[PDB]
Amino acid sequence: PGSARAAVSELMQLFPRGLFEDALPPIVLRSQVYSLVPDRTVADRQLKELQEQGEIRIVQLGFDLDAHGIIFTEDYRTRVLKASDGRPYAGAVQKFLASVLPASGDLSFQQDQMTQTFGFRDSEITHLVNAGVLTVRDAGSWWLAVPGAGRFIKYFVKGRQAVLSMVRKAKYRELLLSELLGRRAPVVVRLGLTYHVHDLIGAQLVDSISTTSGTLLRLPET
């Protein structure tokens, strides 16, 4: 009833665009959606509906317990076109965005489909790899990829570890949500405390316990 769409918009607002100088489309992770939409089946169904209505792209990122990213297709398009301006791979990127991206919601593309169905030459596929738009998936396919995602991946994993440590260091390896969110962020946490808390909850790296003091984040040792 708009649940996943509302969750995506709440999480998108947390993304610090300026951290990457606006070079990356804002990214939210599937497990963050589960923090706000705890019925995973409802969340997945509504995300699939958004994918089939053409509004979001699902991207393989590969974090333990939070494998997929979610991006608005128009944010991906406008900025990939922007990251490609005046570069050698601009033509190949434009062809990919105009013809391949609209043709499905898939996370990956087969080599034979790219060459035979869409008419890409090997050199043009190499341009897409150099642009950061494709990465190798297996011997016959490529993942859709986000130019500049490597920096996001490194900041994200370090921040996940640091926020989890804030919980681990607390008494009995548990910390109230209001307490955590009011702490100074460890310097390595670049994407923000709240952004990270939603990943920890949705991935089940912390349990979200309802108490008469509000939400308690508990490391799930048992």
Residue numbers in the entry: 33 to 254
Sentences from the paper on this structure:
Serine/threonine protein kinase 19 (STK19) has been reported to phosphorylate and activate oncogenic NRAS to promote melanomagenesis. STK19 has also been identified as a putative factor involved in the transcription-coupled nucleotide excision repair (TC-NER) pathway. In this study, we determined a 1.32 Å crystal structure of human STK19 protein, revealed that STK19 is a winged-helix (WH) protein instead of a kinase, and performed structural-guided analysis of the STK19 molecular function.
The structure of STK19 reveals a compact fold consisting of three winged helix (WH) domains (WH1-WH3) packed together. Electrostatic surface analysis of the STK19 structure reveals a large patch of basic residues centered on the WH3-H1 helix. These residues include R183, K186, K190, R192, R200, and K201 of the helix WH3-H1, K203 and R205 in the following loop, and R215, R216, and R222 in the H2-H3 loop of the WH3 domain. Mutations of these conserved residues, namely K186E, R200E/K201E/K203E, and R215E/R216E, abolished dsDNA binding. We selected and purified to homogeneity four STK19 protein variants harboring the patient mutation.
